[PDB]
């Protein structure tokens, strides 16, 4: 016979964590270190590159934090990529690179720093930082926010990192977390990084799987089969997309099939609504009367 643990006193003295920590979504330690600004720069904000991965989507946002809540500057989603020519693999490492490049270009379009700070126009996979222009405004400085996602060399968040850096944004970083970093010989093999930028690993998997298991190739790569897209024309898909991303990085919202009021009215039809006090009092009275049958 052990003591019941979950007493009323246990609940009384319990201190609930922050709402978004109890959801397991925000690391407030890292958030404090990222967001907090030098008090002698007063109202100049720090800008975060929020990078989040869902099971189907890549979300990249440029955010500054304020007391009333975070405020989005620009945002690029992976589902915007089909507009630019990438329809499948919307969560590749290369799709991450494309989303990072798109958000960088879109932010620079919003600011007006398009002609200045074009970025790395010829992606060869070399490590490079956006250098300031003499006698001109400094490049838009942004710090990377990978959230709760673990830091591994080859992770997809650093694809958005490299894309945003190549898009003209100044994002301070090091190359030892990029795919293709040799940890033993501390130098970056830029050829393998460039391979990863243009979907080289996926194309090589297509080629390696096709001659080793055609049935698995048929199930895994269906969309490619009905589009008649082979490995050798994978690279162009990104290279054109790059160009298209640089041609018009502006955000185009999806035309909505229904209005806000129609959406609200449709959703409001479902979801149960709370009972009035009198209703539950009647329920209690019924339960008391209906308890009368087990008097033994």
């Amino acid at each position: 016979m052990q003591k019941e643990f979950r007493t009323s006193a246990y609940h009384s003295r319990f201190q609930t964590p922050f709402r978004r920590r109890q959801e397991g979504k925000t690391d407030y330690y890292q958030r404090k270190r990222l967001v907090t600004q030098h008090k002698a720069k007063y109202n100049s904000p720090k800008y975060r590159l929020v990078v989040r991965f869902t099971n189907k989507d890549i979300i990249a946002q440029i955010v500054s934090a304020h007391i009333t809540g975070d405020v989005v500057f620009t945002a690029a989603y992976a589902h915007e990529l089909p507009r630019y020519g990438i329809k499948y693999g919307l969560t590749n490492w290369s799709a991450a690179y494309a989303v990072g490049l798109l958000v960088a270009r879109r932010a620079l379009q919003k600011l007006g720093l398009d002609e200045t700070y074009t970025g790395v126009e010829e992606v060869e996979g070399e490590f490079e930082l956006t250098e300031a222009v003499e006698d001109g405004p400094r490049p838009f400085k942004v710090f990377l926010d990978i959230g709760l996602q673990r830091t591994t060399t080859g992770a997809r968040v650093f694809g958005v990192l490299k894309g945003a850096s190549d898009g003209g944004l100044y994002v301070p970083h090091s190359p030892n977390r990029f795919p293709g970093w040799d940890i033993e010989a501390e130098e970056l093999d830029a050829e393998l990084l460039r391979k990863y930028i243009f979907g080289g690993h996926v194309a090589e998997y297509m080629e390696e799987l096709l001659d080793d298991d055609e049935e698995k190739y048929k199930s895994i790569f269906k969309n490619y089969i009905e589009e008649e897209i082979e490995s050798e024309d994978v690279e162009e898909i990104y290279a054109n997309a790059h160009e298209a991303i640089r041609a018009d990085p502006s955000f185009k919202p999806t035309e909505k099939k229904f209005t806000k009021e129609q959406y609200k009215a449709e959703s409001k039809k479902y979801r149960q609504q709370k009972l009035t006090r009198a209703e539950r009092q009647a329920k209690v009275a019924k339960k008391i009367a209906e308890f009368k049958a087990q008097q033994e």
């Binding site: 958030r31 008090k39 007063y42 109202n43 934090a65 007391i67």
Partner: protein
């Protein structure tokens, strides 16, 4: 043996509030302090750097310096028969804007608005605050409120 250390007697003063331990809400790090601001001082026990001395816990002062993570606050402390100007470096976790500014700064605006409106109407308005004055005459209606007579009650034991 006598003990007189830096944080002596701060067992309860420097405690976190009940069910309020742990991480700092981030509005503390988002507030902006400018030279001349009036701030209340309340030491946070969980941040030990830039922490005030126990004297300044509960004191209010003027910001004179702004640094990377801290502000300098001027406090006047009684030393004998005069005040001495004290300059304390405090991280912003132990600092909060004083709410006494916002009441007086609003009364200045209200007086300015009232003055122009009376000026607009070509009349006069009085802006000085007044203490509560004795109440005027009044008439008490007894419809539904005829006086009920009370008497002191006898002594009883209820144990």
């Amino acid at each position: 043996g006598k003990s007189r250390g830096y944080r002596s007697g701060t067992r309860y003063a420097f405690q976190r509030d009940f069910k309020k331990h742990g991480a700092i809400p981030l509005s503390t790090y988002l507030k902006v302090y400018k030279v001349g601001d009036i701030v209340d001082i309340k030491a946070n026990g969980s941040i030990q750097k830039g922490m005030p001395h126990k004297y300044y816990h509960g004191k209010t002062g003027i910001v004179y310096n702004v640094t990377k993570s801290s502000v300098g606050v001027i406090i006047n402390k009684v030393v004998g028969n005069r005040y001495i100007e004290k300059r304390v470096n405090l991280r912003v976790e132990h600092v909060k804007h004083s709410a006494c500014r916002q009441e007086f700064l609003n009364r200045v605006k209200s007086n300015a608005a009232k003055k122009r409106e009376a000026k607009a109407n070509g009349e006069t308005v009085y802006l000085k605050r007044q203490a509560a004055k004795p109440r005027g005459s009044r008439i008490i209606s007894t419809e539904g409120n005829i006086p009920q007579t009370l008497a002191p009650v006898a002594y009883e034991t209820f144990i």
